[PDB]
Amino acid sequence: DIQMTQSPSSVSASVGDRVTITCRASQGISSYLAWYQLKPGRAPKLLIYGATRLQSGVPSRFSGSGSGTDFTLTISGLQPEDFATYHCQQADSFPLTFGQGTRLEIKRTVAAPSVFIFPPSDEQLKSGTASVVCLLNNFYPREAKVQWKVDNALQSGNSQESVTEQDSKDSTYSLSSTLTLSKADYEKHKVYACEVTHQGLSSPVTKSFNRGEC
Amino acid sequence: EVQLVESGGGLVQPGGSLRLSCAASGFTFSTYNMNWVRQAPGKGLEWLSYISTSSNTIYYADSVKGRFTISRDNAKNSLFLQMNSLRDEDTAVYYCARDRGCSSTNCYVVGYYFYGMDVWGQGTTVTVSSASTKGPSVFPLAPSSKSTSGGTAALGCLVKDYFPEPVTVSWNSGALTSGVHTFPAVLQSSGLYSLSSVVTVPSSSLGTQTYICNVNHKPSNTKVDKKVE
Amino acid sequence: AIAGFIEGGWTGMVDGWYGYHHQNEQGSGYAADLKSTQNAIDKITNKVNSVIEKMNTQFTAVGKEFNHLEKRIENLNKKVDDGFLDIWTYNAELLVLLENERTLDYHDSNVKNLYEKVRNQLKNNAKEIGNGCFEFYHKCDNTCMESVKNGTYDYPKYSEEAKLN
Amino acid sequence: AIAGFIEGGWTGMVDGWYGYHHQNEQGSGYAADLKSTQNAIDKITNKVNSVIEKMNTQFTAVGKEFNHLEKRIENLNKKVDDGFLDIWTYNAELLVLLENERTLDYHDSNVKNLYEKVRNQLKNNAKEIGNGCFEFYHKCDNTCMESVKNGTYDYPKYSEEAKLN
Amino acid sequence: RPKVRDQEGRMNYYWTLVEPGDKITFEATGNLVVPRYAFAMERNSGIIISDTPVHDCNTTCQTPKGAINTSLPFQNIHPITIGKCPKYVKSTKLRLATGLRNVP
Amino acid sequence: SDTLCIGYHANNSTDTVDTVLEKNVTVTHSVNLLEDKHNGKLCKLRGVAPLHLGKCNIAGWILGNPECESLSTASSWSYIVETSSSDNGTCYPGDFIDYEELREQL
Amino acid sequence: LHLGKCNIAGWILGNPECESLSTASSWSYIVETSSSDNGTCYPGDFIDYEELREQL
């Protein structure tokens, strides 16, 4: 198929600044290009059609132009209600290949995360599989990593993270990592720590607990 | 008004079939074109098929390879999609869309798909997996006071090994709203989802105040309440 | 060119305005063009919007009431109401008469532009028997029939077999 | 025929609208026609004067002021001021839309009238490869290039050498 | 009357034309504002509200937002026009094409 | 060997026109039939110098308002120019009957 | 705003046969009927009446 390419993957800008999101086609079209505004839980809305005009109901803050394969979506009137994922669509020929998607985020000051860690209870260890949950709140940006270390040894292949969306008021994120361990391997180890690596922290915060004091 | 209503959700085992439906009202159905655009979790939009008013020129995507069958009816104003040979990669949210037709502001003569699509619908959740329906496993987390410089604490519950997605996790049947944050579901390697939910509480009433973690699984009708202490 | 050199339109092709009817050893059927029809639709769709978007009417009234003690201004109001009506009886009925004269000429221009798209590529490789038909002097499969629609028909490449028959 | 059978115009010939590009053994360069360009300029220059000389306006005013005790006649004055404006929003914007449609058609007619001036004199003495090009099958000097521009190209006088190549 | 410009009274001003050979007649016993000067006039234009300065230039049409020398069929600046003036439209571009389509 | 190609005019013009075939079409040469420019001056009409009143309106000049004393009325004019701040007209209030007819007669 | 059987002069003056009427806070046009005879119950010469029908 005729593939599409967007750049970059995520744009972080504030209200009032200029947002430049490009979408280059692999072949020459020069007349037909679509642009959608996809929201989670809502229907997408066509913003730009043909890369020259604007759809009815769309405000005049959006703008698009280009001839050939180079096209530019210029936003000089950015509102707080427009921080969403945008997609480009080729209209000719078939198939109607959509874009990759570019998430627009609110730019603010870098904040330090608050590290929390929950020890496993007695109801989860008796079931045969226990898990330790580490919590990260009030951090920016979304690029945060959780380094699980058990008895001063880095673990891999048995952890999974879960990140929420951006906050409407604080413009922050929330992260929760879960390290899955078996019943026989839980009683062998004693120290369970959650080392946090963040851009806003000058030193890695490592919170741990005791296995016999859960 | 001009709107599209999607229906036909549920749980389909791999190797079966599923027929989707899209209702249309408030506009002429026998003059415009229709499409099928899905959205995988973690991916973007994906065009599937195209049909005309006379159902003569029918297109298919590269990911379909003739496995799907799209039909319509101009008299009943309906759009159907007979899907066959469903696998685990077909788990997406299927929508319905109408082509624009022209380049002017008001298209009085409907053309083709050369100027994108404008009308969009709500969509339905379609999940195809070989795993059966399994109730969630609720385990409470032990509270602890780790925020020394902030003087706060945290507590919550861990929900794992359930099918299908999602699970709406609340606290005190919706009464507790301060500090409640719901994490999205992440699919594990075993074929089941997992999510968490925490409540930010101060460290003054950590070892005295308790909360009830309410777990509500909507497709399986499973409601498990576990006290966190 | 309806009821002229060409007889008329067909009811088999309902997927557009213009197109071609394939007839060879591989099959047959009706097929409309996606390039020439979509461009010609935008010419007529902007023509309808040329008298709607440019007619910048305001939130006012055209009709008005008057008393019969003011028959001096009621006659001028008759020149306002029926005077604009007599212009709109003249100008608007001329627009529908002249733009449909343009549309029947532009559809005739869409005939001739599609004819010159075929005739300049099939000077000696097709027989002109009228009614928009072009019988090839060689083998022309479904890939060859789609090349004349998009305009990708090379003349010296297909003239090697048409000169023998 | 811009963005059609012909690609577009050139920036080398700035001495007129239409013309020819000479390319032979004696030299090369751009040259515009003195007969076809000057006649076609007078078509467009009289078109601009068609809406200026015929618009016989008088020494009067279009706008007028009124009092708010005369709102019965102020509504008719709104039908005089904005009513003639809505005609001028309709009629004047249609003229620029239709005469430029006539100008683009007459320039396309200036292409076809210059094409039939060449094609009727070069039926077998030139190869039609598109984009307004006509490659001769024999020697054509600068005197021969000026004969096709003025229309003084005899067909049997130059067909003796073109039939050999 | 209501107090306008610290004056509780009004004064209605009237006017008429006098034909050549006609004799005007005034007769009143009070509340008459008699004229001091007269304006002898002879004609075959309207009013303009603007803040543009005056110069010794010459043109064929006048507009409040500036001088206009047309020699053009249409204009789009102001409807209140005085003299041999072009038509007023609400459009922003009415450019008549004379040359070919600018495609390189 | 020779090449005779029909040439057409093209330049770097940015003025676009409106056609029924396509909107926003760039042309090479064009005459702007819509006057969008303005000199910003009050010129004459057919050699006749107009009458400018300044801060006073017509009713301040036809009645003799005392704040419009610095004024040299010419023997002929073609139009009367008022200002947006023309408040020094009728210094005494009143109902100017048939006032709109007198603004066109003079 | 729909006045029913009464015309504008029955509404702007307060005719008693047009009591069952709920006047909205905003409108765009006034609708009269062909049998609008229950307007001015007392006769008179409504001076400048045609300009008042366009102002409201």
CATH number at residue A41: 2.60.40.10
Residue among C162, E91, A67 at smallest CA distance from D96: E91
> Do D and B have ≥3 inter-chain CB pairs under 8 A?
no
Kindly write down the DSSP assignment for every residue of A167-179, as one continuous string.
Answer: -SSS--EEEEEEE
Q: What's the CATH code, domain C19-163?
A: 3.90.20.10
Task: Answer whether E90's CB lies under 8 Å from E76's CB.
Answer: yes
Chain C residue with CA closest to G47: the answer is C67
Residue among E67, E93, E99 minimizing CB distance to F41: E67
> With contacts defined as CB-CB under 8 Å, which chain G residues touch C64?
50, 54
d(CA B213, CA B158): 9
CATH architecture of B137-228: Sandwich (2.60)
Cβ pair D69:G48 closer than 8 A: yes
d(CA C139, CA C48): 44
Chain C residue with CA closest to G28: the answer is C59
Task: Answer whether B192's CB lies under 8 Å from A180's CB.
Answer: no
Q: Would you call D127 helix, strand, or coil by DSSP?
A: strand
Per-residue b/e over C98-129, b at no fewer than 16 CB within 10 Å? ebeebeeebeebbbebbbebbeebbeebbeee
A127 and A67, same domain (yes or no): no
Residue among F12, F20, F28 minimizing CB distance to D97: F20
SS3 content of chain D, % helix, strand, coil (to 5): 50, 15, 40
Strand order in the sheet with E47-49: E47-49, F80-82, F51-52
Q: Of A106, A125, A146, which marks where a domain is finished?
A: A106
> With contacts defined as CB-CB under 8 Å, which chain C residues touch F34?
none
Residue B178 to residues A169, B143, B199, Cα–Cα distance (Å): 14, 17, 7
Q: What's the CATH code, domain B3-128?
A: 2.60.40.10
Cβ pair A96:B142 closer than 8 A: no
Beta pairing partners, B144: B154
Q: Does G27 touch chain C (CB under 8 A)?
A: no
* Residue from F21, F25, F34 to probe the interface with C (highest C Cβ count within 10 Å): F21
Count of CB pairs separated by less than 8 Å, D with E: 91
Cβ pair F11:D11 closer than 8 A: yes
Count the domains in chain A.
2
Q: Resolution in A, one decimal? A: 3.5
Cβ pair D85:E79 closer than 8 A: yes
Cβ pair F52:E50 closer than 8 A: no
Q: Which chains touch E (3 or more CB pairs under 8 A)?
A: D, F
Beta strands in D84-146 (DSSP E): 126-128, 133-136
d(CA C120, CA A19): 49
A94 and A8, same domain (yes or no): yes
CA atoms within 13 A on the CB side of D30: 16
Task: Answer whether A74's CB lies under 8 Å from A20's CB.
Answer: yes
d(CA B143, CA B121): 44
Establish whether domains B3-128 and B137-228 are of one fold: yes
Distance between D15 CA and the closest CA of chain E, angstroms: 13
DSSP state of B142: P
Kindly write down the DSSP assignment for every residue of E15-55, as one continuous string.
Answer: -----TT-------SSS----S----------EEE----EE
H or E element in which residue D159 lies: helix D155-162
Distance between F64 CA and the closest CA of chain C, angstroms: 35
Q: Does G19 touch chain C (CB under 8 A)?
A: no
H or E element in which residue C112 lies: helix C71-119
Beta pairing partners, C128: C134
* Side chain identity at residue D11, one-letter code: T
Task: Answer whether E97's CB lies under 8 Å from D104's CB.
Answer: yes
Chain D residue with CA closest to C73: the answer is D73
Beta pairing partners, D28: D23
* Number of Cβ within a 10 Å radius of residue B19: 12
Q: Which chains touch C (3 or more CB pairs under 8 A)?
A: B, D, F, G
> With contacts defined as CB-CB under 8 Å, which chain F residues touch E16?
none
* Side chain identity at residue A35, one-letter code: W
* Residue from F6, F13, F28, F105 to probe the interface with D (highest D Cβ count within 10 Å): F6
Q: Would you call B212 helix, strand, or coil by DSSP?
A: strand
Q: Is cis: bond before E2, omega within 30 of 0? A: no
Q: Which chains touch G (3 or more CB pairs under 8 A)?
A: C, D
d(CA C158, CA C162): 7
Residue F37 to residues B199, E76, F32, F40, Cα–Cα distance (Å): 67, 10, 11, 9
Cβ pair B111:C14 closer than 8 A: no
> With contacts defined as CB-CB under 8 Å, which chain D residues touch E100?
2, 9, 17, 107
SS3 content of chain A, % helix, strand, coil (to 5): 5, 45, 45
C112 φ/ψ sector (left φ>0, alpha ψ -120 to 50, else beta): alpha
Cβ pair F1:D19 closer than 8 A: no
* Side chain identity at residue A17, one-letter code: D
Kindly write down the DSSP assignment for every residue of chain F, as one continuous string.
Answer: ---EEEEEB------EE--SS-SSEEBSSEE--EE-----SEEEETTB--EE-TT--HHHHHTT-GGG-S----S--S-EEE-TT--SS-SS----TTHHHHHHH-
d(CA E46, CA F45): 13
Kindly write down the DSSP assignment for every residue of chain G, as one continuous string.
Answer: -B-TTS-HHHHHTT-GGG-S----S--S--B--TT--SS-SS----TTHHHHHHH-
Chain B residue with CA closest to C42: the answer is B102
Looking up tokens 């210059």 gives D114
Cβ pair C41:B56 closer than 8 A: no
Q: Would you call B35 helix, strand, or coil by DSSP?
A: strand
Cβ pair D8:E104 closer than 8 A: yes
Domain residue spans in chain C?
A: 19-163
Tell me the residue range of the domain where A190 lies: 114-210
Kindly write down the DSSP assignment for every residue of C4-24, as one continuous string.
Answer: TTS----SS--SSSSEEEEES
d(CA G7, CA F91): 43
Domain residue spans in chain B?
A: 3-128, 137-228
A134 and A197, same domain (yes or no): yes
Distance between A94 CA and the closest CA of chain B, angstroms: 8
